[PDB]
């Protein structure tokens, strides 16, 4: 990736093998888990298009998921190429030839030319848009992975509120929806799918209840105290 | 694909050997249309044939996360 | 994080992956323990708001607890313009906009804006304030994690003082009170909650008896204050 | 309020006599806070008292929309 | 209210007797049904607050609901007089002095004065806001009048989709929620509160269809998904 | 609607209470029947989208058809906009915008604005278009209403021709098929679906003639109940 | 508070004891807030939990005054 600024003009340095070993270990440990998606974004530095494919290409077993993701990348790249900064015909000598959908990636762009269009004149966010398209593909992979819907999570006869809540958050994490929609649902769905004993406690919490107060309210043994007879 | 072999193992086995392709991009696309129903077991082949031509890998993957494996529970919504 | 002193002005760089791996493993095994809180303060030197946000988003198993922390940051951010200065709105050309409540974190302001106001004008403690709010969230998580209370914790009949005192210290960490009040409570606590075998020798050290003297007495008696018959 | 008379029946009767009262608007409003609970039955009164001080007619109606019958688990027919 | 344009400038005329008698009969016939809310807006031709207040003042038996509506209107007037510009106390000669929150009300205003601000200086939208407040209060009344709510709707063992959806359409105008939420609720509610026989039919159709297509699918299968077929 | 022209310029008058009551009552008593479609044309004197929309919104318990109809209207408005995009976007100063495909909808444009493009500048038939879209929605609704289909009609053993012909013509109302196709079907269906006793009479009458002649013969032969039973 | 002991006897007994405590006000206020609910009888404790956190003795006593007896219902003794 590209790095250096205050100590001089930026230079592309080769990505660390320690990070590659960690990526292989993360894939082996939990390939399809949603926590991988921000981890990839967090580890990503100095976006150079060629380097962005290293994570995709150094994958082990689950190659099929990456290949499905490439079709999503192709669809995004083509859509960008035809509807957004579209260019076709002649352009003046010396110019960086207004990059096409395939050229944004390392697929039809060579490194010295690619580095040249990144450092000669003010920044071009070619790696950043490509990285966003990868997140859009990763969002699909967690949806494909998921075996349970939001409504499938219920609290069984002898199942604690703690472990019921854990499952609800786990399926909510893979739900891929609006912030407002998730909140608006969360207020009723937990009460709807709760076991009778805990449901009475939850039902009398009342509208506009914070997660922090829900945590403090559900902290104790949950024995005798409240009586629902008003809703 | 064997009768007790899950669809995901079969897909991983296909993509894993497809790394060693040593052949044209045109040929890979052309093969991908027929190969999935062609090398399928009889249990999953009926669904793959039901989906039929004009289906993308995302669409097929979505459909196939509904059928599961042998002795499993039915998926609906 | 922003780092550099001796070589010149500070530059925004990424956290070490080697350190991230070390952080991830302790969080996997000791998730709700207070022993990970000093590690967060020590390792978060030169914090940049976006980078702090990545840590919250990359949560695994202990995800449900982290969601309460997400709510707490939003409430603290709101309080920062309602209880603390709202600071007008309109601003003359050629000034860096200045940070509102949500601009303290990564929610509304960009990385270029964050680095800009910390470098161009005298450093704003936005990373320190967000770090302070995250630590406040960790204290709340520790508080909700706690399973027992000071009155409830009583030494078992076959239980030794060394294993009982550990439970008292673990319980005490989540109590959040002033040191003078904690001393005032602690003063009679050991003889109050001790078992009958322990109580007879424990109260025989003189008036009150300081905790180091109680530990000194505990050393000489051996085991639950009786030789053999442990199990 | 009788044994099997719901809040809806009782409140309609209370406003029917209030139509003919012919009194100061402040006095009618000021009296209303005590009158509604004063002439209520003990089963209904316990939940009305549980709402606590400073409760509006809208808030009372909202509670009465979930009280159930003339008090839950007691026959209404 | 005030009417006329082509024949000359606006003249005051009282509300029609058939409209008032129909309004009395509709309340006797249909009570607080949601269908009365658009009908009331249509019947109340010409928004002059004193004349509009006459419809409220002529309501019979269901007086208890009117008290809550009257207090709701008073709260809305208080909100209007506070949040939106309050304006200066004295005014320049020739002007009629701009209406306050309490001036909308029949108690504070005189009819000659009220007509004056709708025919001398540029028309103040007093009728539009007074009706908006009444409609807002009527919206609260349908919630009180409701005998059931959307998550309490459930398809019975022998009920066809027609019986289930007849009940859903009857409580649809008691929802009073945002269109965004309502679209999401419509997509989710129908499938999850359906009976097992109907669930198979809905499952076979699957996502990616219009309301008409789903209705057509339900129409073709007959009964709850099959029934008596003596032909 | 906008009333008259002989006395002078057109004047907007809100929909008549008697017509609104009659419309609501007809919808209640005849439900989703094919006979409601010409009644809608009959009770819609003067066409304005907002006024027409109000009539749909005044409907009682029978809300389900109105919701389906409302979705159909939205599709037609969307269709008109993509079918005709020629006048889309900004217009020269002095022109009052003029209707777009969505402006035809009573839920889009304002009442003064609607009258503007119906008589203050070149008349666009927006109300007549809205009525036509409503009729298309009603044509779709009668498909749902229908309880029996043409080839499943079998005349009972003691059932006379008068019940059977009435059922056939009533059933045929909701098919919307062309007259040439209907006339071709009418030629053979009458003898085909007939009971054995009436079938021989139709066979005896045979080829040619007309409906009046067939009915004349049928009316003249009398009921199926004989007094010897040569039938 | 025992099974038949009322709040009036119980609060008075606490204050009789509290006066001889000879200690700082913050410690007194801190122990007062949680102790009364915890050592209350199950019947009264349910009502105290329903009333819940906030305020001081005045509002809490005002609520207890209206609740009456040793919990349960009025029309026992």
Swiss-Prot record, chains A, C, E, F:
Residues 145-231 are annotated as: Dimerization/Multimerization of capsid protein p24. Changing residue 53 to L: Loss of infectivity. Changing residue 38 to A: Retains infectivity. It comes from the Viruses. It is found in: Virion. Changing residue 142 to T: Loss of infectivity. The modification Phosphoserine is found at residue 16. Phosphorylated possibly by host MAPK1; this phosphorylation is necessary for Pin1-mediated virion uncoating. Forms the conical core that encapsulates the genomic RNA-nucleocapsid complex in the virion. Most core are conical, with only 7% tubular. The core is constituted by capsid protein hexamer subunits. The core is disassembled soon after virion entry. The capsid promotes immune invasion by cloaking viral DNA from CGAS detection. Host restriction factors such as TRIM5-alpha or TRIMCyp bind retroviral capsids and cause premature capsid disassembly, leading to blocks in reverse transcription. Capsid restriction by TRIM5 is one of the factors which restricts HIV-1 to the human species. Residues 85-93 are annotated as: PPIA/CYPA-binding loop. Changing residue 37 to S: Loss of infectivity. The chain holds residues 133 to 363 of 500 of the full protein. Changing residue 176 to A: Retains infectivity. Residues 57-95 are annotated as: Interaction with human PPIA/CYPA and NUP153. Changing residue 57 to A: Reduces binding to human NUP153 and CPSF6. Reduces infectivity to non-dividing cells. Retains infectivity to dividing cells. It comes from Human immunodeficiency virus type 1 group M subtype B (isolate NY5). This is Capsid protein p24. Changing residue 173 to K: Retains binding to FG repeats of human NUP153. Homodimer; the homodimer further multimerizes as homohexamers or homopentamers. Interacts with host NUP98. Interacts with host PPIA/CYPA; this interaction stabilizes the capsid. Interacts with host NUP153. Interacts with host PDZD8; this interaction stabilizes the capsid. Interacts with host TRIM5; this interaction destabilizes the capsid. Interacts with host CPSF6. Interacts with host NONO; the interaction is weak. Coiled coil: none annotated.
């Amino acid at each position: 990736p590209i790095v250096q600024n205050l100590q001089g003009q930026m230079v592309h340095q080769a990505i660390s093998p320690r990070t590659l070993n960690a990526w292989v270990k993360v894939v082996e440990e939990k390939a399809f888990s949603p926590e991988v998606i921000p981890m990839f974004s967090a580890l990503s530095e100095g976006a150079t298009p060629q380097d962005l494919n290293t994570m995709l290409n150094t994958v082990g077993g689950h190659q099929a998921a990456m290949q499905m993701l490439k079709e999503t990348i192709n669809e995004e790249a083509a859509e960008w190429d035809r509807l957004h900064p579209v260019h076709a015909g002649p352009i003046a000598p010396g110019q960086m030839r207004e990059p096409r959908g395939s050229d944004i990636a390392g697929t039809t762009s060579t490194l010295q030319e690619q580095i040249g269009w990144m450092t000669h004149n003010p920044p071009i966010p070619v790696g950043e848009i490509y990285k966003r398209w990868i997140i859009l593909g990763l969002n699909k992979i967690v949806r494909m992975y998921s075996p349970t819907s939001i409504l499938d999570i219920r609290q069984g006869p002898k199942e604690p509120f703690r472990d019921y809540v854990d499952r609800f958050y786990k399926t909510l994490r893979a739900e891929q929806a609006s912030q407002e929609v998730k909140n608006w649902m969360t207020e009723t769905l937990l009460v709807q799918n709760a076991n009778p004993d805990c449901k009475t406690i939850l039902k009398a919490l009342g509208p506009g209840a914070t997660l922090e107060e829900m945590m403090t309210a559900c902290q104790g043994v949950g024995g005798p105290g409240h009586k629902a007879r008003v809703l």
